[PDB]
Each structure stands twice: as structure tokens, then as C-alpha cells.
Design a protein around this ligand. Structure first.
Ligand SMILES: Cn1cc(CC(=O)N2C[C@@H](C(N)=O)C[C@H]3C[C@H]32)cn1
Ligand SMILES: [Zn+2]
Length: 139
């Protein structure tokens, strides 16, 4: 679990979105595993605007933060789950690191701010849904 709070928006993994998230829906994209809902309170997370390939993510299944090198956002094949059929997930970045399904929602940050959230995992690879291209999150 986990979310990004920026301005009047809440960014979560689409597969973990609540009834409240869907009732205040702003935007969602199944191909990216993202959902953004509106909030009443103000968010102060800074979204990174960059091409960094190094950062730190939070891993709840280890209660630890790990530094990682990660790939450029791209279309990557992802296995079927109770949430999606087998498909290409877009805007996904991979890194060598530990993750388990409940780790979804952990933030990846670089020196510029929030880069994305944990979304996929398996075989010692962790995948993060990028949010740096969503320029409207700031305005
Ligand atoms: C962080 N993490 C996720 C997994 C499994 C995994 O790859 N998943 C894929 C995800 C998706 N974006 O399609 C849906 C849920 C089932 C999860 C393992 N560690
Ligand atoms: Zn950066």
C-alpha cells in the first residue's frame, strides 16, 4: 500500500484504488496501473521532473529503503493477476531489488522529488510506475 499526495490529488496503484478513489476519480490508465483521485486536503509532495536513473525506494516487506539504478520508462510485459490479464504495462521502470505484491505503492524518489510508485515485481526485479511525465499533477 501507499500513495503520492500532491496539491488536491492522490496518486495510487489503479489495482489498489478504493471506492472513495473511484467516486472522486480525476484520471486512470489501466495500461500504467495508475489512478488519480481528488482530495479535500492539500498535498506537499514534490514530483521530480528529470531523466534520473538512480534513486531510493521504500520496501514495506523489509521496513527499509533501498538505493537502486532503474531503467527508462517503457512498455514491459507483465503476467496475469486477479487484477489484470497478461499485458504490456506502459511507463514502467525496472530495478534489481526485492519486492512482494503488498509493496505496491512504495515511493521511488531521486534528489528532485517523487519519481514513481512500486507497481510490479518478481524474480528479484522491482518495477515502478513513472509519474514524471504527468505535468498536470502540479497545476
Ligand atoms: C511490487 N510487487 C508486485 C508483485 C506482483 C506483480 O508484479 N503484480 C503486478 C501488478 C500490475 N501492475 O499488473 C498487479 C499486482 C499483482 C501484482 C510483486 N512485487
Ligand atoms: Zn531526478
Amino acid at each position: 500500500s501507499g500513495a503520492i499526495y500532491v496539491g488536491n490529488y492522490r496518486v495510487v496503484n489503479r489495482h489498489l484504488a478504493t471506492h472513495n478513489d473511484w467516486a472522486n476519480l480525476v484520471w486512470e490508465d489501466s495500461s500504467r496501473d495508475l489512478l488519480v483521485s481528488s482530495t479535500t486536503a492539500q498535498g506537499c509532495d514534490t514530483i521530480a521532473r528529470c531523466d534520473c536513473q538512480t534513486g531510493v525506494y521504500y520496501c514495506s516487506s523489509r521496513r527499509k529503503h533501498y538505493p537502486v539504478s532503474f531503467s527508462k520508462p517503457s512498455l514491459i510485459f507483465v503476467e496475469a493477476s486477479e487484477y489484470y490479464p497478461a499485458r504490456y504495462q506502459s511507463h514502467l521502470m525496472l530495478a534489481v531489488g526485492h519486492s512482494e505484491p503488498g509493496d505496491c505503492g512504495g515511493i521511488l524518489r531521486c534528489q528532485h522529488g517523487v519519481v514513481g510508485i512500486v507497481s510490479t515485481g518478481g524474480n528479484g526485479l522491482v518495477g515502478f510506475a513513472d509519474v514524471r511525465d504527468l505535468l498536470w499533477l502540479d497545476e
